[PDB]
Amino acid sequence: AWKGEVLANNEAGQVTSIIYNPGDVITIVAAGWASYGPTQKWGPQGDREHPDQGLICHDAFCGALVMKIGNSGTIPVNTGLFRWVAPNNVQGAITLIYNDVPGTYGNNSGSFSVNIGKDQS
Numbered sequence: 001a002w003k004g005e006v007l008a009n010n011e012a013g014q015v016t017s018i019i020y021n022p023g024d025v026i027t028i029v030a031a032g033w034a035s036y037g038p039t040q041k042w043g044p045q046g047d048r049e050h051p052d053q054g055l056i057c058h059d060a061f062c063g064a065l066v067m068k069i070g071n072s073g074t075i076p077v078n079t080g081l082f083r084w085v086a087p088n089n090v091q092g093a094i095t096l097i098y099n100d101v102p103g104t105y106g107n108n109s110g111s112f113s114v115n116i117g118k119d120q121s
């Protein structure tokens with residue numbers, strides 16, 4: 001399993017100890033408060049009022065928690081995944097990432113605490 005924090009200002013994301021393999025069932029639970037710039041902070045679902053100005057994940061709000069599995073595109077995690085199975089031919093190490101616009105991570109603050117584990121399958 002993996003337990004740690006994902007820094008909002010870390011554009012390269014947070015590499016976990018989870019290597020997603022075909023058929024794996026995983027659970028993720030994310031918590032905490034972060035910001036993509038403003039003094040206000042948002043949870044793992046991000047800011048539902050802020051327009052997408054070029055986010056790394058166009059399927060989640062700005063400031064939401066997202067992930068990459070191997071060399072995959074960004075996949076929304078938000079508050080978490082419940083006994084989740086990846087799309088076909090998606091595999092590799094899970095990288096957790098704060099959802100923001102490329103080049104604009106420098107002014108981000110806070111972090112999400114996250115747990116990831118592989119489930120019975």
Ligand SMILES: OC[C@H]1O[C@@H](O)[C@H](O)[C@@H](O)[C@H]1O
Pocket residue numbers: 036037038051052053062100101104105107
């Ligand atoms: O839309 C994303 C952008 O939002 C702004 O409000 C913020 O100051 C920028 O750093 C960038 O994150």
Ligand SMILES: [Ca+2]
Pocket residue numbers: 036037100101104105106107108
């Ligand atoms: Ca920002």
